A = this chain, B = another copy of it.
Amino acid sequence: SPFPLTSMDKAFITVLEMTPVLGTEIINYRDGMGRVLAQDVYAKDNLPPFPASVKDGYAVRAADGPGDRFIIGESQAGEQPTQTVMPGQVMRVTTGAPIPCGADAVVQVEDTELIRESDDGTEELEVRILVQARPGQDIRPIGHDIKRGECVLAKGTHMGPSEIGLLATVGVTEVEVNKFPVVAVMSTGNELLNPEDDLLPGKIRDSNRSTLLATIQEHGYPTINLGIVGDNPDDLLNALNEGISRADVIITSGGVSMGEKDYLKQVLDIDLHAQIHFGRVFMKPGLPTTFATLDIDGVRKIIFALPGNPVSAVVTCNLFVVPALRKMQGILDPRPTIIKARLSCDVKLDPRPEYHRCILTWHHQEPLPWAQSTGSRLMSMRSANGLLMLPPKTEQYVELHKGEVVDVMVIGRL
Contacts and interface: CB of A to CB of B under 8 A. Distances in A.
Interface of A: 29-30, 32-33, 45, 47-50, 56, 74, 76-80, 92, 94-98, 109, 154, 156-171, 173, 189-192, 195-199, 201-215, 217-218, 231, 257-262, 308, 310, 314, 337-340, 357, 362, 365-369, 374, 381-385, 405, 410, 412-414
A310 B339 CA distance: 31
A183 to B, nearest CB: 13
Contact of A231 (B77, B204, B212, B217): B77
A356 B47 CA distance: 21
A79 B231 CA distance: 13
Contact of A191 (B96, B173, B337): B96
A158 B410 CA distance: 17
A234 B97 CA distance: 22
Given A94-B259, A210-B168, A173 B195 contact: yes
Identical subunits present: 2
A204 B48 contact: yes
A362 B337 contact: yes
B164 A214 contact: yes
A314 to B, nearest CB: 6
Given A49-B199, A337-B414, A78 B192 contact: yes
Contact of A49 (B163, B204, B211, B314): B204
Contact of A195 (B171, B262, B362): B171
A210 B164 contact: yes
Contacts of A97: 191
Contacts of A413: 337, 410, 413
A191 B198 CA distance: 61
A405 to B, nearest CB: 6
A123 to B, nearest CB: 10
A217 B30 CA distance: 10
Contacts of A365: 340
B192 A161 contact: no
A160 B79 contact: no
A191 B95 CA distance: 11
Given A171-B195, A211-B162, A56 B261 contact: no
A259 B195 contact: no
A275 to B, nearest CB: 27
Contacts of A257: 56, 94-95
A343 B369 CA distance: 18
A77 B164 CA distance: 51
B383 A78 contact: no
B197 A171 contact: yes
Contact of A368 (B56, B308, B368): B368
A33 B367 contact: no
B76 A261 contact: yes
B362 A165 contact: no
A382 B156 CA distance: 10
B50 A201 contact: yes
Contacts of A49: 199, 203-204
Given A77-B190, A173-B196, A338-B362, 4 more contacts: A48-B204, A49-B203, A162-B374, A413-B413
B381 A165 contact: no
Nearest to A217: B33
A223 to B, nearest CB: 11
Given A162-B384, A215-B161, A205 B169 contact: yes
A261 B168 contact: no
A210 B47 CA distance: 17
